[PDB]
């Protein structure tokens, strides 16, 4: 019922006496204990008048503590926090700049209807203040109000009031009007952040240098939004940004990189500005892969893009993207990926002595992605595919089951970009007919015995061994069994009649896969029909594939290179997936 709720004794009644004791070092303690309480989920709502009364103080720690408490009620239950607006108001006038800032920020974190009446004017007064810490708040709090409903005409006042303090003396202050503004501007009527520009640009790229870690970053971001028109406009902006191989190891660099690359449309190299820039951009990226793991990941997810658009930049620096045994799987994968993309026609020497390293390590997922990477390699550089296929044999003879199976599947894709060139090896691959438990590996063999059928006189009792447990088989293994036992009949008869019966038997009659049924039929409607015209639709030349997959749509590439810093650069997806 209301059992255990009494407030005539217990912990709450105790704290109530403590919040009224006239020894402030005991009041302070109470309010620590109360804040403690909220966080563990207790109902301190009944102590509210008593906590509020503790603001009637000289003491700063004590006022600051009451504030922390009211702030807990801010998003939590907004109503509660409102009950003491009549104290935020006549509490942004006090001296101590610390207190003024403290009371403004708090009001802006409240969200109900009656927040406007009391916040309007005292924010008008806060943006005009001797202390940059109070304008630095007043600033960020303009944003806050924007969220609670209203295009607010006076807000047109504020909307401007932000602008005018972008030409402010403090970089903490400015770089904050900006970050405030640049997000205000993503609720878009068509003209905002509006352009007093050469000033906007000139006074920002000076804020940018005396700035903090974080002031830099949101500035760099506001830039890239704007479009220049001329060479020397772009040029000068870029040299000013350039010193950003700097502080925030990672967001600072990559917001620099963002800018230096929207403004990469120039008359390049009559004189070589273009060629200095692209030289410059090598080192700072490079050094990100020495920072923290998480950030390495974002940086790598950005290098990925970057390296599709301007593959010049890191052409020479394949060395940083080498796998360190102790990195996280997710930083191992994104590296491997870029190791293929920068995989030139030269380095494949070492790149391959690396991928052989990994494919023999103890992390299974990564070993599989290694051997596949050794396919990606050979199918993007033929001046090496030969050495690949050798590398792959090494591993197949080391016997590690999961290394063998991944190795075979790559061998096929390799037997297909470079057809009729590695026919010798087939018997080395058939040594290991034994232990291909995985279903992909099998369909890799079967298709191998599929083409190159005549090169093995023993290609017969190979296929017969699989028919035993013909079910128990991935349907993709049977699809591969069928196409490959009619690649065998369009050549060898009579010895094959033993089987091509028992086989096509099941695709059309036993198996219930209606897609298998269709493809089984289609065939019987060719072979047990006409021995010549079956050939020309089936053994028809497969065209040479190219390196089809790993590569992004260049329209989309551009858009994402404009988002270099953000989430879109991690997901590789336009924003509108996550509105």
């Amino acid at each position: 019922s209301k059992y255990f709720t009494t407030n005539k004794k217990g912990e709450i009644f105790e704290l109530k006496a403590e919040l009224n004791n006239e020894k402030k070092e005991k009041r302070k303690e109470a309010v620590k204990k109360v804040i403690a309480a909220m966080t563990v989920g207790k109902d301190v709502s009944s102590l509210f008048p008593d906590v509020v009364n503790c603001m009637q103080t000289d003491n700063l720690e004590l006022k600051k503590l009451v504030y922390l408490y009211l702030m807990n009620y801010a998003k939590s239950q907004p109503d509660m926090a409102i009950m003491a607006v009549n104290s935020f108001v006549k509490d942004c006038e006090d001296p101590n700049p610390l207190i003024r800032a403290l009371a403004v920020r708090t009001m802006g974190c409240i969200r109900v209807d009656k927040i406007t009446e009391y916040l309007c004017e005292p924010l008008r007064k806060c943006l005009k203040d001797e202390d940059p810490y109070v304008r630095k708040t007043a600033a960020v709090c303009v944003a806050k109000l924007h969220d609670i409903n209203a295009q607010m005409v006076e807000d047109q006042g504020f909307l401007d009031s932000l602008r005018d303090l972008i030409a402010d003396s403090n970089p903490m202050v400015v770089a904050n009007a900006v970050a405030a503004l640049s997000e205000i501007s993503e609720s878009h009527p068509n003209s905002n952040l509006l352009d007093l520009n050469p000033q906007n640009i000139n006074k920002l790229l000076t804020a940018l240098n005396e700035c903090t870690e974080w002031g830099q970053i949101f500035i760099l971001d506001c830039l890239s939004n704007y479009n220049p028109k001329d060479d020397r406009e772009a040029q000068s902006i870029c040299e000013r940004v350039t010193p950003r191989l700097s502080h925030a190891n990672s967001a600072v660099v990559l917001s620099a990189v963002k800018v230096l690359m929207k403004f990469l449309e120039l008359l390049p190299k009559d004189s070589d500005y273009y060629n200095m820039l692209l030289k410059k951009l090598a080192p700072p990226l490079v050094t990100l892969l020495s920072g923290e793991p998480e950030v390495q990941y974002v940086a790598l997810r950005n290098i990925n893009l970057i390296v599709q658009k301007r593959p010049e930049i890191l052409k020479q620096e394949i060395k940083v993207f080498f796998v360190k045994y102790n990195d996280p799987i997710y930083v191992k994968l994104e590296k491997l990926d870029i190791m293929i993309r920068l995989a030139s026609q030269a380095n494949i020497a070492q790149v391959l002595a690396e991928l052989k390293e990994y494919a023999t390590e103890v992390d299974v997922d990564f070993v599989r992605k290694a051997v596949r990477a050794i396919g990606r390699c050979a199918i993007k550089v033929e001046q090496s595919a030969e050495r690949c296929v050798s590398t792959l044999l090494d591993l197949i003879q080391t016997k590690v089951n999961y290394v063998v199976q991944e190795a075979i599947v790559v061998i096929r894709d390799i037997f297909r970009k470079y057809p009729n060139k590695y026919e010798s090896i087939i018997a080395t691959l058939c040594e290991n007919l034994d232990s291909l438990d995985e279903p992909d590996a099998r369909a890799a063999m079967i298709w191998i015995v599929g083409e190159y059928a005549e090169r093995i006189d023993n290609a017969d009792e190979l296929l017969e061994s699989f028919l035993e447990g013909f079910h128990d088989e991935s349907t993709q293994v049977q699809l591969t069994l069928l196409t490959a036992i009619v690649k065998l009949f369009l050549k060898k008869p009579s010895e094959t009649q033993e089987l091509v019966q028992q086989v096509l038997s099941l695709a059309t009659q036993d198996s219930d896969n209606p897609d298998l049924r269709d493809r089984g039929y289609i065939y019987w409607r060719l072979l047990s029909t006409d021995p010549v015209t079956a050939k020309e639709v089936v053994l028809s030349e497969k065209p040479l594939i190219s390196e089809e997959t790993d590569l992004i749509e260049p329209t989309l590439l551009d858009e994402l290179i404009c988002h270099i810093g953000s989430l879109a650069s991690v997901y590789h997806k336009p924003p509108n997936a996550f509105v």
Binding site: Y3, F4, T5, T6, K9, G10, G41
Partner: protein
């Protein structure tokens, strides 16, 4: 039968724990944890009954406190659900508007009350009048 009775605050702290089955201390500590994870995560809308390991739990909360009985699967939910409430009124009477700190500072008394109402994993005495009468006689002894 009742396997154990816990009283527990939101924050996971045990204020009473009574076992009626053989368990090691680790296992006890484990169970008190498991019970907390299940019960704090359920909002007023859920039932007061929930299957737990190979038994079940009836619980209700009062202010910051979850009262829980773990009982056999075939035991009558609503009987136990109201045993909990019958026990809390006696507690309320016996401490005069009971609060949590009552249970902390008089924890050894709390086991007197439990033992009056529960024993050998069964409801013992259900009348609030008789239990009070006995508790107040017990209090006045030396």
């Amino acid at each position: 039968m009742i396997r154990f009775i816990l009283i527990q605050n939101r924050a996971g702290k045990t204020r009473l724990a009574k076992w009626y089955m053989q368990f090691d201390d680790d296992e006890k500590q484990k169970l008190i944890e498991e019970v907390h994870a299940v019960v704090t995560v359920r909002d007023a809308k859920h039932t007061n009954f929930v299957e737990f390991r190979n038994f079940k739990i009836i619980y209700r909360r009062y202010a910051g406190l979850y009262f829980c009985i773990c009982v056999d699967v075939n035991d009558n939910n609503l009987a136990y659900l109201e045993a909990i409430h019958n026990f809390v009124e006696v507690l309320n009477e016996y401490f005069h508007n009971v609060c949590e700190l009552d249970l902390v500072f008089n924890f050894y008394k709390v086991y007197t009350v439990v033992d009056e109402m529960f024993l050998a994993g069964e409801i013992r005495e259900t009348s609030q009048t008789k239990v009070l009468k006995q508790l107040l006689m017990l209090q006045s002894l030396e």
